[PDB]
Motif scaffolding. Structure first.
Motif, PDB file in Angstrom:
ATOM      1  N   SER A   1       0.918  -1.054   0.086  1.00 16.91           N
ATOM      2  CA  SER A   1       0.077  -0.113   0.066  1.00 16.91           C
ATOM      3  C   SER A   1       1.049   1.292  -0.225  1.00 16.91           C
ATOM      4  O   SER A   1       0.572   2.547  -0.617  1.00 16.91           O
ATOM      5  CB  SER A   1      -1.046  -0.139   1.254  1.00 16.91           C
ATOM      6  OG  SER A   1      -2.054  -1.003   0.876  1.00 16.91           O
TER       7      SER A   1
ATOM      8  N   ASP B   1       1.366   3.540  -2.945  1.00 15.01           N
ATOM      9  CA  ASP B   1       0.435   4.697  -3.296  1.00 15.01           C
ATOM     10  C   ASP B   1       0.784   5.496  -2.483  1.00 15.01           C
ATOM     11  O   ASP B   1      -0.024   6.590  -2.509  1.00 15.01           O
ATOM     12  CB  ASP B   1      -1.101   3.944  -3.193  1.00 15.01           C
ATOM     13  CG  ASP B   1      -1.127   2.731  -3.995  1.00 15.01           C
ATOM     14  OD1 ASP B   1      -1.053   2.723  -5.137  1.00 15.01           O
ATOM     15  OD2 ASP B   1      -1.711   1.683  -3.571  1.00 15.01           O
TER      16      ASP B   1
ATOM     17  N   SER C   1      -3.409  -2.210  -9.391  1.00 17.03           N
ATOM     18  CA  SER C   1      -2.857  -2.091  -8.071  1.00 17.03           C
ATOM     19  C   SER C   1      -2.421  -3.331  -7.493  1.00 17.03           C
ATOM     20  O   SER C   1      -3.010  -4.184  -7.351  1.00 17.03           O
ATOM     21  CB  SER C   1      -3.637  -1.289  -7.312  1.00 17.03           C
ATOM     22  OG  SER C   1      -3.184  -1.149  -5.782  1.00 17.03           O
TER      23      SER C   1
ATOM     24  N   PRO D   1      -1.129  -3.971  -4.581  1.00 14.23           N
ATOM     25  CA  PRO D   1      -1.768  -4.289  -3.362  1.00 14.23           C
ATOM     26  C   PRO D   1      -3.355  -4.749  -3.575  1.00 14.23           C
ATOM     27  O   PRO D   1      -3.607  -5.673  -2.561  1.00 14.23           O
ATOM     28  CB  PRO D   1      -1.899  -2.812  -2.711  1.00 14.23           C
ATOM     29  CG  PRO D   1      -0.729  -2.150  -3.278  1.00 14.23           C
ATOM     30  CD  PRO D   1      -0.458  -2.477  -4.718  1.00 14.23           C
ATOM     31  N   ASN D   2      -3.962  -4.296  -4.269  1.00 11.86           N
ATOM     32  CA  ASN D   2      -5.323  -4.718  -4.593  1.00 11.86           C
ATOM     33  C   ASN D   2      -5.458  -6.385  -5.128  1.00 11.86           C
ATOM     34  O   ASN D   2      -6.001  -7.118  -4.574  1.00 11.86           O
ATOM     35  CB  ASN D   2      -6.108  -3.736  -5.754  1.00 11.86           C
ATOM     36  CG  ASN D   2      -7.531  -4.199  -6.118  1.00 11.86           C
ATOM     37  OD1 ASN D   2      -8.380  -4.900  -5.060  1.00 11.86           O
ATOM     38  ND2 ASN D   2      -8.264  -3.459  -7.094  1.00 11.86           N
TER      39      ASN D   2
ATOM     40  N   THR E   1      -4.501  -8.377  -1.939  1.00  8.67           N
ATOM     41  CA  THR E   1      -5.598  -8.566  -0.898  1.00  8.67           C
ATOM     42  C   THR E   1      -6.552  -9.339  -1.517  1.00  8.67           C
ATOM     43  O   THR E   1      -7.268 -10.163  -0.558  1.00  8.67           O
ATOM     44  CB  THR E   1      -6.030  -6.943  -0.564  1.00  8.67           C
ATOM     45  OG1 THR E   1      -7.233  -7.413   0.496  1.00  8.67           O
ATOM     46  CG2 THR E   1      -6.666  -6.299  -1.690  1.00  8.67           C
TER      47      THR E   1
ATOM     48  N   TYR F   1      -9.915  -5.952   2.878  1.00  7.29           N
ATOM     49  CA  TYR F   1     -10.232  -4.252   3.324  1.00  7.29           C
ATOM     50  C   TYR F   1     -11.804  -4.324   2.785  1.00  7.29           C
ATOM     51  O   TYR F   1     -11.913  -3.952   1.559  1.00  7.29           O
ATOM     52  CB  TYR F   1      -9.455  -3.234   2.700  1.00  7.29           C
ATOM     53  CG  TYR F   1      -7.812  -3.760   3.211  1.00  7.29           C
ATOM     54  CD1 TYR F   1      -6.726  -4.569   2.663  1.00  7.29           C
ATOM     55  CD2 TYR F   1      -7.205  -2.943   4.025  1.00  7.29           C
ATOM     56  CE1 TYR F   1      -5.763  -4.732   3.037  1.00  7.29           C
ATOM     57  CE2 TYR F   1      -6.040  -2.904   4.540  1.00  7.29           C
ATOM     58  CZ  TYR F   1      -5.280  -3.861   4.079  1.00  7.29           C
ATOM     59  OH  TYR F   1      -3.938  -4.062   4.722  1.00  7.29           O
TER      60      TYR F   1
ATOM     61  N   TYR G   1     -11.320   1.198  -0.838  1.00  9.66           N
ATOM     62  CA  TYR G   1      -9.845   1.441  -1.538  1.00  9.66           C
ATOM     63  C   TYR G   1      -9.206   2.460  -0.469  1.00  9.66           C
ATOM     64  O   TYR G   1      -8.110   2.253  -0.310  1.00  9.66           O
ATOM     65  CB  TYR G   1     -10.263   2.272  -2.872  1.00  9.66           C
ATOM     66  CG  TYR G   1      -8.706   2.566  -3.533  1.00  9.66           C
ATOM     67  CD1 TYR G   1      -7.929   1.543  -3.768  1.00  9.66           C
ATOM     68  CD2 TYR G   1      -8.144   3.719  -3.343  1.00  9.66           C
ATOM     69  CE1 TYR G   1      -6.621   1.462  -4.453  1.00  9.66           C
ATOM     70  CE2 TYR G   1      -6.873   3.878  -4.244  1.00  9.66           C
ATOM     71  CZ  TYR G   1      -6.308   2.805  -4.423  1.00  9.66           C
ATOM     72  OH  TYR G   1      -4.858   2.751  -5.103  1.00  9.66           O
TER      73      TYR G   1
ATOM     74  N   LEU H   1      -7.708   0.214   1.884  1.00 12.74           N
ATOM     75  CA  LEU H   1      -6.483  -0.442   1.649  1.00 12.74           C
ATOM     76  C   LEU H   1      -5.484   0.404   1.597  1.00 12.74           C
ATOM     77  O   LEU H   1      -4.321   0.017   2.440  1.00 12.74           O
ATOM     78  CB  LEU H   1      -6.953  -0.984  -0.020  1.00 12.74           C
ATOM     79  CG  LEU H   1      -5.913  -1.629  -0.750  1.00 12.74           C
ATOM     80  CD1 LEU H   1      -5.325  -2.910   0.013  1.00 12.74           C
ATOM     81  CD2 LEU H   1      -6.287  -1.954  -1.963  1.00 12.74           C
ATOM     82  N   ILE H   2      -5.398   1.573   0.968  1.00 13.93           N
ATOM     83  CA  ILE H   2      -4.419   2.362   0.928  1.00 13.93           C
ATOM     84  C   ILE H   2      -3.623   3.031   2.248  1.00 13.93           C
ATOM     85  O   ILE H   2      -2.563   3.255   2.365  1.00 13.93           O
ATOM     86  CB  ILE H   2      -4.151   3.549  -0.102  1.00 13.93           C
ATOM     87  CG1 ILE H   2      -5.456   4.495   0.291  1.00 13.93           C
ATOM     88  CG2 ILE H   2      -4.578   3.051  -1.410  1.00 13.93           C
ATOM     89  CD1 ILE H   2      -5.495   5.910  -0.495  1.00 13.93           C
TER      90      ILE H   2
ATOM     91  N   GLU I   1      -4.192   1.008   5.189  1.00 15.07           N
ATOM     92  CA  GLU I   1      -3.851   0.153   6.062  1.00 15.07           C
ATOM     93  C   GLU I   1      -4.534  -0.241   7.134  1.00 15.07           C
ATOM     94  O   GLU I   1      -4.126  -0.414   8.412  1.00 15.07           O
ATOM     95  CB  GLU I   1      -2.452   0.113   6.321  1.00 15.07           C
ATOM     96  CG  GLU I   1      -1.182   0.269   5.385  1.00 15.07           C
ATOM     97  CD  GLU I   1       0.113   0.246   5.529  1.00 15.07           C
ATOM     98  OE1 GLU I   1       0.365  -0.293   6.472  1.00 15.07           O
ATOM     99  OE2 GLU I   1       0.759   0.798   4.776  1.00 15.07           O
TER     100      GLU I   1
ATOM    101  N   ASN J   1       0.109  -5.918   3.528  1.00 15.75           N
ATOM    102  CA  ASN J   1       0.679  -4.648   4.568  1.00 15.75           C
ATOM    103  C   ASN J   1       1.136  -5.227   5.766  1.00 15.75           C
ATOM    104  O   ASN J   1       2.169  -4.459   6.188  1.00 15.75           O
ATOM    105  CB  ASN J   1      -0.594  -3.571   4.779  1.00 15.75           C
ATOM    106  CG  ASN J   1      -0.701  -2.754   3.420  1.00 15.75           C
ATOM    107  OD1 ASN J   1       0.301  -2.601   2.516  1.00 15.75           O
ATOM    108  ND2 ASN J   1      -1.849  -2.720   2.929  1.00 15.75           N
TER     109      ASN J   1
END
Ligand SMILES: [Cu+2]
Ligand SMILES: [Cu+2]
Ligand SMILES: [Cu+2]
Ligand SMILES: [Cu+2]
Ligand SMILES: [Cu+2]
Ligand SMILES: [Cu+2]
Ligand SMILES: [Cu+2]
Ligand SMILES: [Cu+2]
Ligand SMILES: [Cu+2]
Lengths: 423, 424, 422
Positions: free
Chosen positions: A397, A400, C241, C243-244, C247, C277, C292, C295-296, C298, C336
């Motif tokens: 994350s 970003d 993304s 991270p997307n 997850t 998330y 979202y 997620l960003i 955490e 994360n």
């Protein structure tokens, strides 16, 4: 790309229509904003449901779409390569939503995105800006001169921040001595500083790691002498209250106390430090960002940075190396708060110096290493082949929030180590 | 103490004027509050923009000032030593803002700050309160007695909290046995407990680490026997649901299972454990603090503590040692949630027992070690020279939530290892 | 003994001072009936809503909360539902019961039935991995991965849209020998909305293979790479993304065996920890959706072993026998959070620090930090029987779905641990 161009859209009601509303960046609060992208860029579009109807975003000529988001705050991100120049509608495919106003243009323009001319000083430490291995030589007295400078720096394309630094860069100078050396440290606090500054070296033994001797008024100088008794890779930082404040603002660096042998011979060395910045406004906001005390004490930062800035190790000061070279990265976390899961995409660490111990044998064949704040490590690996290798905190994350670096290494796309297709 | 006296000011509109408003502590919601400090104290002032005009705070006689903060929530912290007794204006230098009401007094008073007489039990474990090395001796049966006690404790100077403990202190008793020993554990849950209590030892092998045998009703007693099969420095904790709740409230401690040799001989040993408390009201709020479930399950604590209390290892029970001594710290994280970046400012760890392995060779010349919740380690170092050495989690925002300790070691200010001025 | 949890907020509803249910089968209900099965462990979380003094009491269990005074002040309590029937929970503060603060705990005989599932089971069985490779020479190994987007059972009445390798979380356990040449085929299913890819932490070159495996839906990429270094490596999708993609469930483990093989062990297990998330809190029924901003920032709702709540307790627990040496390959997909990995009732004989398969393992270790994009190996001997519990020792993550069982038959009382004195 590993640096996608990102656009966030929130669905809602504006100008008498059901629309997309831009969030952050060059598109904040604009309705059905034009998404300007350059040929060959990777585009990430984050769709967030604002008002609670069913929505997606679709771009026909890229066969690119979000998923359908139903409830308020429901999100879907999608990406694509902007391979075709021209203008392309992004729209909602839900019955009637496009007619109702849910439609904007993606504009793909030929040629490479220019850098936005900066307004503040470049405060990014080049990762190649460190002294090389000390010769084999006797222990001796080494004079180190540090200057504490408060100054505006270019935090991002179009965004500034007031950094506190050692010698006008983040991280501070890479200090390299030999175990047994006597360090004669001069700390000069610039005349134009508002704050008292100091230094604590994790490689010094005695009150505050030198902090209790280096509390320096603006326009003043303190001098401390200390013996480098222990070999190691040590973070140093300001230790004037609020220490967390002095650290987030950029007052951290690395001291290598070399063991008598020196470190293992290696072709190329790099200096990288991770830290956080806690701003009032979200990541991506243009203008002068300011410090948010409630975010700092609650550990909720907006910026995660390598060497002081967004684009530090991608645009302004990336890492360059050659195939066949063994590379060492001195990596430390100024912090002040977050533990890095340090990793290089496309590489494996031949050696990792556990907890920054230069005297204990390194661990071998390691993908990713936890480095705490006020901690450092050493990793080395051989560049067997070419590519763009990407430095990350694998708490991903943080991509970003500005946390990504490039190690650029020229060589063919396809060799025996990695290639497209079978044997 | 070098421990800074902190004041938070929010700019705003009150009593028909543009003013500073106090946030938390003895100044909460007061307009242009008097900041009372004692001669020679270090003063930290956090300025936070409330209403969105341009502001600073200035104190002329100390040449001390914040930066200008412009937007809402924009902050600037500054510090100085309160070296001169008397009364000094703090004010905003922006055009007209002082005239408009932005002005208060700093009062610097002679003599040392008194400590507030406590209201609740002292629940802080002294860091010197542990058994010393076991002699060389054969494995044997060892009876251990634990009592689970729920009681109000002094969390800070003027703030209390309802702790759950082993034997009325945080952390619980330091348990020291030899590998091969048979442990006969008696858990007595006090009559006045509302909750069932239990114990899981990370150094025990079998259901719940003993938890499945020690679920003890109030006024009742469980007895479990277990063999200490593995040497190590083990956190033990309550394992009655909610386990995170029982842990935050203070039900954690260390079990040392000594290897056959014993641990390397050292001059002085210390017992330190880090944990978090999740209160409804922010850090620095006076009165009876209460537990905030949404903060606990979301990992948003207000207090980060060594041995149970703010000032535990600075005011009430600091560490004392002598120059020349090798010092060992048994350091564990009860948690329940946060990993400590454990570090002693002004020292380097000669030895670090990584992941609390007492059987693997320790790492050497280490500045800082990650210790997870339900993890412990051993660090040792030689006190080459004197000073106040400071225990921290190097996630240093946790300073501002009560997490700091002192190791006091008298010796000269200047010697050959560290001194002011250049080398002679 | 994985506790049945109920959260109550005090407040004003239906013209009375009441308890109001929060989440689960009781969300927004006033004085909700708490349905529990005989012998279940019950956790009741009391949260003060409106700011009067409150507790909850159950007389026939001598179970009570503490008194909670301010808004948001909380007290949790637990007990074993050993007695069948109906029992009042009530507030003991003067007059509060009369004012309406009272509901029933219903303890029903027999075991709780499983909720009939709505979506595909996306939980990787922890026993679903290849065993040790024989001693043999380096060779070319073909690996086939398929990226599949599909609805999965996140919790027993809750669904989510997973992105996976081969329809399960984590993806297939890949096992090669150092020196092996890997011929990787990535097929992205025709029904995928997104481009998918793979980065192996055990591959050397652009994106760890990601730069060669960006695969359009219905398409196939092929990459070859040499496993140059032994280790236990997480692999993941590396399409933005990232991270997307992570997850949503696109992570797995690659073991590159050292020349010797790993130490001989009786039984092996595959476990990976990740976060989800969601817009709605943990415990919310129905189709959960991705948030979202969470997620960003955490701020996840779900902490999971192998893709789902109950993955390693109800649907696919770990099974072993007393006397066996067990190895767990444990990795954190993340994206994360660092796991404080621990097995309640066991000690790690060996821990392969930072997933180093070549450096000597650490010995007699209670708990090990594993970062996201990190993996480790732990082994231990099952000296005796019991239910052994896998946790992240950041234990608030229990209350977000993060718990597993290692079930091992044997007596309650033996010489290693028992009830009385010796
Ligand atoms: Cu729509
Ligand atoms: Cu400073
Ligand atoms: Cu430090
Ligand atoms: Cu002002
Ligand atoms: Cu308890
Ligand atoms: Cu535990
Ligand atoms: Cu009540
Ligand atoms: Cu993917
Ligand atoms: Cu990765």
């Amino acid at each position: 790309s590993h640096a996608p161009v990102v656009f966030t859209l929130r669905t809602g009601i504006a100008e008498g229509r059901m629309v997309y509303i831009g969030v952050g960046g060059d598109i904040d609060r604009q309705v059905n904003p034009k998404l300007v992208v350059h040929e060959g860029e990777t585009v990430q579009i984050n769709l967030i449901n604002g008002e609670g109807a069913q929505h997606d975003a679709v771009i026909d000529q890229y066969a690119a779409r979000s998923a359908i988001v139903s409830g308020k705050n429901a999100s879907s991100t999608f990406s694509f390569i902007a391979s075709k120049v021209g203008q392309f509608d992004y729209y909602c495919s839900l019955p009637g939503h496009r007619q109702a106003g849910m439609q904007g243009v993606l504009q793909v323009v030929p040629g490479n995105r220019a850098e936005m001319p900066s307004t503040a000083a470049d405060i990014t430490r080049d990762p190649a800006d460190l002294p090389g291995p000390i010769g084999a030589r006797q222990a001796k007295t080494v004079r180190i001169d540090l200057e504490t400078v408060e100054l505006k720096g270019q935090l991002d394309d179009k965004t500034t921040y007031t950094y506190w630094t050692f010698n006008g860069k983040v991280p501070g100078p890479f200090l390299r001595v030999r175990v047994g050396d006597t360090v004669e440290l001069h700390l000069k606090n610039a005349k134009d500083s508002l704050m008292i500054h100091s230094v604590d070296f994790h490689g010094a033994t005695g009150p505050g790691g030198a902090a209790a001797y280096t509390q320096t008024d603006p326009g003043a100088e303190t001098v401390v002498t200390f013996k480098a008794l222990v070999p190691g890779i040590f973070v140093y930082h300001c230790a004037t209250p609020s220490v967390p404040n002095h650290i987030t603002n950029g007052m951290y660096g690395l001291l290598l106390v070399e063991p008598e042998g020196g470190l293992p011979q290696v072709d190329r060395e790099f200096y990288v430090m991770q830290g956080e910045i806690y701003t009032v406004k979200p990541f991506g906001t243009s203008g002068e960002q300011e410090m948010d005390y409630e975010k700092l004490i609650s550990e909720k930062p907006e910026y995660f940075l390598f060497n002081g800035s967004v684009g530090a190790l991608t645009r302004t000061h990336p890492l360059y190396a050659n195939v066949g070279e063994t590379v060492r990265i001195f990596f430390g976390v100024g912090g002040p708060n977050f533990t890095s899961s340090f990793h290089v995409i496309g590489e494996i660490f031949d050696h990792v110096y556990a907890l920054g111990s230069v005297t204990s044998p390194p661990l071998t064949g390691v993908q990713t290493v936890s480095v705490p704040p006020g901690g450092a490590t050493i990793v080395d690996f051989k560049l067997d082949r070419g590519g763009r290798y990407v430095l990350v905190d694998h708490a991903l994350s943080r991509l970003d929030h500005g946390l990504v670096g490039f190690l650029n290494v020229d060589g063919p796309k396809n060799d025996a180590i990695m290639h497209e297709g079978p044997p």
